[PDB]
Amino acid sequence: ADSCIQFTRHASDVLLNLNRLRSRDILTDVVIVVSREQFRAHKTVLMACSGLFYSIFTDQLKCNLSVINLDPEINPEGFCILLDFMYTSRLNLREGNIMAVMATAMYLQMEHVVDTCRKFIKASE
Amino acid sequence: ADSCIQFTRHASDVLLNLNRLRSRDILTDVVIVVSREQFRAHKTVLMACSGLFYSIFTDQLKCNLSVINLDPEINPEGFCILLDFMYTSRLNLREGNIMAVMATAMYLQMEHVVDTCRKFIKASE
Amino acid sequence: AWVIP
Amino acid sequence: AWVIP
Ligand SMILES: Cn1c(=O)ccc2cc(Nc3ccnc(Cl)c3C#N)ccc21
Ligand SMILES: Cn1c(=O)ccc2cc(Nc3ccnc(Cl)c3C#N)ccc21
Ligand SMILES: [Cl-]
Ligand SMILES: [Cl-]
Question: Where in the cell is it found (chains A, B)?
């Protein structure tokens, strides 16, 4: 109906609670492996944030995998920063990590992050 | 780090994408039964919105159930309205459904919805 | 919170 | 959108 009321903070409260489940390792259903590092997460959150994970977990065979190995060129810290952004809306972008974060966001198909990385790089040129 | 940037629309975009997965029945992992009606959903979203589902899916036996039957006194339309609110932040509150929505929100332990229902009832008294 | 969206 | 939170 077009007569709905809306609770402004609802989406952020949901995301905060999903990150609390991740912290507590509650109902995490996939491990993403990035070189030597492992990250536990929820497939639905990954799919909701990343075009690559959306394609992976909608595939009729890969949807059932409990481990996904990323390309060995992907930087684990870059992935960690992007996984935290998925679950919090906050991106820890720094001079020392921007190239790794941008390359990881391009691979993960997260256009908005790629955009802000390009802007920060262009500003320093 | 305290040096993060934030993407304002991220939490709402995640919620919209989770609702699109629900619409498409992608990676739904539980059916909630309310009298004769069945509702497919994602356990993590239910837990992130409801104190009752948080308690249910953190229980060491119930976390593994694929079907949860609610109390037969719960109104299916009331539940449907609250499930849509979980996935969209929008509550279709109407004169004809407010008592059922409030009773369902009390059972589901969704305090903010109980609050707005009490306020709308008090305004009509 | 609640608003008219 | 991006902001300083
Ligand atoms: C390209 N791209 C970005 O640049 C950023 C985020 C992003 C998120 C998704 N995810 C979905 C898209 C559409 N419909 C659904 Cl249901 C999902 C989910 N889950 C896909 C592509 C994305
Ligand atoms: C009482 N109550 C409301 O009145 C509304 C919403 C609501 C949502 C939750 N859910 C969580 C709470 C804390 N920590 C976590 Cl990880 C989750 C999850 N998932 C619990 C109680 C609630
Ligand atoms: Cl993005
Ligand atoms: Cl609530």
Answer: Nucleus
Are B92 and C5 in contact by the 8 Å Cβ rule? The answer is no
* Expt. technique: X-ray
The secondary structure of B67-82 as a DSSP string is EEEPPTTS-HHHHHHH
Q: Which atom of ligand 2 is nearest to the CA of B44?
A: 19
- CB A79, CB A32: distance < 8 Å: yes
- Which of B54, B46, A1, A17 minimizes the C-alpha distance to A9? A17
- Tokens coding B90: 């929008």
Within an 8 Å CB–CB cutoff, is residue B45 touching chain A?
yes
Strands B90-91 and A5-6: antiparallel
Domain positions in chain B are: 1-125
Residue with tokens 């691979």: A107
Residue A115: CB atoms within 10 Å: 14
In DSSP notation, chain B reads: -TT-EE-TTHHHHHHHHHHHHHHTT-S--EEEEETTEEEEE-HHHHHHH-HHHHHHHHSTTGGG-SEEEPPTTS-HHHHHHHHHHHHHSEE---TTTHHHHHHHHHHHT-HHHHHHHHHHHHHT-
* Beta-carbon separation of C4 and A6 below 8 A: yes
User: What is the number of CB-based contacts under 8 A between chain B and chain C?
Assistant: 4
What are the chain B neighbours of D3 within 8 Å (beta carbons)? 5-6, 8
Where are the alpha helices (H) located in A24-110, listed in sequence order?
Answer: 43-49, 51-58, 76-88, 98-108
